[PDB]
């Protein structure tokens, strides 16, 4: 079921500028479309050079990301404008989100209040509600993959980015090669079990703990420790960080950081939880 993308030179149509993102398999650059002057983010994904290579991204994996992206139109999720390709790269022309990572914002700013945390979290929940309503599991939710529209307002607006691990969950679970960042992955990821929408809900619990405390709940000194911690549900609320945080906030996290995916809050549960619900 593979398709093909526009094979004119991206350079003919766009000018690139500042670098917005860089990872193992992709680089993201601001860009401007010549015909309109509108600005975008160009994500250059390196292709695989042979069938059996570990370097670059398989065409299947690229096309999955593109196909999911084409489905989406919501204020809290990145959208896709165009796709180009050449021998080396697939080039996704994505919506531009220019206010930086939530990761960097958190690093740079004072500790959040519950209101500040919930103003972020509610947007994340709304985006994930959209995705999950479409049976799209993101599988890579973390502060690095939440981008701020404008970092210089009291209550920054966000979009979820980076659909490189996202999958359609049309049979309730998927059982494929899916493994994100140890600090954020759910126990079923760690244990290589079938995965569904529920994994993203665990990640949201981790994000929430971080938003409220500045600390990562499962993080060990090595990746293997972090993974062991996740699987064991080895976290606690430290008084030094949480003494002035409401018990209802803690309840919200506690009901997301649950090993059995069936018992974990769903996205609808999270929206109705008393900490969130009006
Ligand atoms: Mg990305
Ligand atoms: Na345009
Ligand atoms: Na939109």
UniProtKB/Swiss-Prot annotation:
Binding-site residues for ATP, renumbered to this chain: 20-28, 43, 95-97, 101, 162
Active-site residues, Swiss-Prot/TrEMBL: 140
Tissue expression notes: Isoform 2 is expressed in normal intestinal tissue as well as in colorectal carcinomas.
Swiss-Prot/TrEMBL induction comment: Up-regulated following treatment with IFNG/IFN-gamma.
Chain ranges of the Protein kinase domain: 14-276
Effect of residue 43 to A: Loss of activity, apoptotic function and of autophosphorylation
Post-translational modification as stated in the protein's UniProt record: Ubiquitinated by the BCR(KLHL20) E3 ubiquitin ligase complex, leading to its degradation by the proteasome. Removal of the C-terminal tail of isoform 2 (corresponding to amino acids 296-337 of isoform 2) by proteolytic cleavage stimulates maximally its membrane-blebbing function.
Subunit: Interacts with KLHL20. Interacts (via death domain) with MAPK1 and MAPK3. Interacts with MAP1B (via N-terminus). Interacts with PRKD1 in an oxidative stress-regulated manner. Interacts with PIN1, PDCD6, BECN1, TSC2 and STX1A. Interacts (via kinase domain) with DAPK3 (via kinase domain). Interacts with GRINB. Interacts (via death domain) with UNC5B (via death domain). Interacts with UNC5C (via death domain).
Domain observations: The autoinhibitory domain sterically blocks the substrate peptide-binding site by making both hydrophobic and electrostatic contacts with the kinase core.
Its job: Calcium/calmodulin-dependent serine/threonine kinase involved in multiple cellular signaling pathways that trigger cell survival, apoptosis, and autophagy. Regulates both type I apoptotic and type II autophagic cell deaths signal, depending on the cellular setting. The former is caspase-dependent, while the latter is caspase-independent and is characterized by the accumulation of autophagic vesicles. Phosphorylates PIN1 resulting in inhibition of its catalytic activity, nuclear localization, and cellular function. Phosphorylates TPM1, enhancing stress fiber formation in endothelial cells.
Annotated family: Belongs to the protein kinase superfamily. CAMK Ser/Thr protein kinase family. DAP kinase subfamily.
Name used for this protein in its record: Death-associated protein kinase 1
Species whose genome carries this gene: Homo sapiens (Human)
Taxonomic path: Eukaryota, Metazoa, Chordata, Craniata, Vertebrata
Gene name per UniProt: DAPK1
Parent-protein residues present: 1 to 277 of 1430
């Amino acid at each position: 079921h593979m398709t093909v993308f526009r094979q004119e030179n991206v350079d003919d149509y766009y000018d690139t500028g500042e670098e917005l993102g860089s990872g193992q398999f992709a680089v993201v650059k601001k860009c401007r479309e010549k015909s309109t002057g509108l600005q975008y983010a160009a994500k250059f994904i390196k292709k695989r050079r042979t069938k059996s290579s570990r370097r670059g991204v398989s065409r299947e994996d690229i096309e999955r990301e593109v196909s999911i992206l084409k489905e989406i139109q919501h204020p809290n999720v990145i959208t896709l404008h165009e796709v180009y390709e050449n021998k080396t790269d697939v080039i996704l022309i994505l919506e531009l989100v220019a206010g930086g990572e939530l990761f960097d914002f958190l690093a740079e700013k004072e500790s959040l209040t519950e209101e500040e945390a919930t103003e972020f979290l509610k947007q994340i929940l709304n985006g994930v509600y959209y995705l999950h309503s479409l049976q799209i599991a993101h599988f890579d939710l973390k502060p690095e993959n939440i981008m701020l529209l404008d970092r210089n307002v009291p209550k920054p607006r966000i979009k979820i980015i980076d659909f490189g691990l996202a999958h359609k969950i049309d049979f309730g679970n998927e059982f494929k090669n899916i493994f994100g960042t140890p600090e954020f992955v759910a126990p079923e990821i760690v244990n290589y079990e079938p995965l569904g929408l529920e994994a993203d809900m665990w990640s949201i619990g981790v994000i929430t703990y971080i938003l409220l405390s500045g600390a990562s709940p499962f993080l060990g000194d090595t990746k293997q420790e972090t993974l062991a911690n996740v699987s064991a549900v080895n976290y606690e609320f430290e008084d030094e960080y949480f003494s002035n945080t409401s018990a209802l906030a803690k309840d919200f996290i506690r009901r997301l950081l649950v090993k059995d995916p069936k018992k974990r809050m769903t996205i609808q549960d999270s929206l109705q939880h008393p900490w969130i619900k009006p």
